[PDB]
Amino acid sequence: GSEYEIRKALEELKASTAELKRATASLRASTEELKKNPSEDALVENNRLIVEHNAIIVENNRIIAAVLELIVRAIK
Amino acid sequence: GSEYEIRKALEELKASTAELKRATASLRASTEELKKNPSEDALVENNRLIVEHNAIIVENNRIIAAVLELIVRAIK
Amino acid sequence: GSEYEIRKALEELKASTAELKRATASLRASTEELKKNPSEDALVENNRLIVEHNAIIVENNRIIAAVLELIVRAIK
């Protein structure tokens, strides 16, 4: 049913939001170490963490878009 | 408000979501080449791809916000 | 009330979207300066701006998720 599917998708959004925090923290830390001890490797490692962070945002947006579609169906 | 405007906005969101996919994949491909052959230019090119990727996310979020506003009007 | 809380949350979202604009512009500017005069420092500074930009996106998604939860409660 619509209420169940929406509840499930929202719980999914919570989980994704949770990874996003752990990633944001992990990323803010590397950026701290990067500026403190800059180097080519430090830059590449920081870029890799940024990409991992962007991809988590993308998953977050994917779930948001799924919730929007479910809400639009529910209010029809 | 209208079912038509929401339908159209959700189709917009899908188009933006599609760019995001093409951008996320291409970003990950470049990140692979970066780690394989790190260099000044490799890093700079990687940053450019990340910025283009973040800008697509921003557009995605913009459409999400428009859909939210339309839903809020429709349910009043 | 539901209508008030949703109105307030959307105003929050708009303020965050505004911050996102200012970050996107400032970020793209550094990316222009970076490619023109690349250097280790230029790269580290660009990475800092990108992270600050990603963090605003995260705030934006946070508000979006709050609005979704308010809408789901309003249509029950």
Q: Which chains does A contact via 3+ CB–CB distances below 8 A?
A: B, C
Residue of A75, C65, A70 whose CA lies nearest to B75: A75
Determined by X-ray
CA distance A34 to C52: 14
Sign of CA dihedral A4, A8, A13, A15: positive
CB contact under 8 A, A40 and B35: no
Distance (Å) from the alpha carbon of C48 to chain A's nearest alpha carbon: 7
List Cβ neighbours of B76 (8 Å cut-off, separation of 6 or more).
Answer: C3
Helix runs in A1-76, H state only: 2-36, 40-75
DSSP C2-25: HHHHHHHHHHHHHHHHHHHHHHHH
List Cβ neighbours of C53 (8 Å cut-off, separation of 6 or more).
Answer: B54, C20, C23, C24, C27
Enter the resolution in angstroms. Answer: 1.5
Residue of C6, C7, B71 whose CA lies nearest to A68: B71
Going along chain A from its start, the domains and CATH numbers come out as: 2-75 (1.20.58)
Classify residue A37 by its DSSP letter. S
Which residue is associated with the tokens 């250097």?
Answer: C39
